[PDB]
Amino acid sequence: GLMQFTLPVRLCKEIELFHFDIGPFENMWPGIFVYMVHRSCGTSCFELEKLCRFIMSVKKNYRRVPYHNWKHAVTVAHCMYAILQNNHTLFTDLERKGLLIACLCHDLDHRGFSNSYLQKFDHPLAALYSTSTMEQHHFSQTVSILQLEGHNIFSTLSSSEYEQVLEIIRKAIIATDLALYFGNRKQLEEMYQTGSLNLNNQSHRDRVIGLMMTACDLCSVTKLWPVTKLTANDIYAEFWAEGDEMKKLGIQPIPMMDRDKKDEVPQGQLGFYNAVAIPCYTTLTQILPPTEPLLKACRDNLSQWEKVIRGEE
């Protein structure tokens, strides 16, 4: 009850900032998550014994893949923490509880392959989940872990509150399918620009939570340049492996996944910032003004990729 998690002074201060990097000490990550849950939600939100046991089962069910790994799960949870903490009064008790767990669980048992590759391979999961294949799987794994003995962190919620929190987590995880982001943001764009956006409209909250999930998921682009640049290596390590597997199926991959076209990376990064990242943090900054530092950091990183193409680095 009176057992608080306390970080060293540099982490205690920097963790409140959007561009915080969780560091290379894997054994500190669970404690960092618990710290964030306690400040974001409260020390009474979860039983510490169950929470700690949930965290370690989630960790065990992330694989040793270059990018879509346990570090990614905690990083995305930390972007969510920073959004919630800078928007104190905009979110319910259930939403703060669910969204931190949603972020931690959002890539559970990821294999380092896209929905497209599961489809072309004809993987069993592609016949079970025709669309947002991996994202339905991540949610399926989340329910299964919550259903392990002494793992039900939501046990002190009522039946209605429990169903509500699992519906928040389900929508939040499905929303991390980037295929769904483009239409979600367009609708948010129209709703903001015609002034019809209403945060007491459940269907509108869902969309806004959705864009928050995309923003947290892409948050590598919002770090200081050295972190962004080194994370890109891990991102392309998965893509190129997938491109290798494409070539094994007798399918030339897209250039993004073809290691033979490494040189085009800087230009591919420009497109993704202009097509995906900047639009995402822009719409998010309009709806939630205090998330402006993500847009700013993302613009700074866009400029760094522009400097790479100009051979300045």
Ligand SMILES: Cn1cc(-c2ccccc2)nc1CCc1ccc2ccccc2n1
């Ligand atoms: C779209 N596109 C195409 C290329 C590309 C094309 C040809 C040759 C090399 C590359 N690269 C990308 C972006 C890759 C990418 C995808 C998701 C990300 C999420 C967070 C941070 C960085 C990310 N970067």
Ligand SMILES: [Mg+2]
């Ligand atoms: Mg994912």
Ligand SMILES: [Zn+2]
């Ligand atoms: Zn992710």
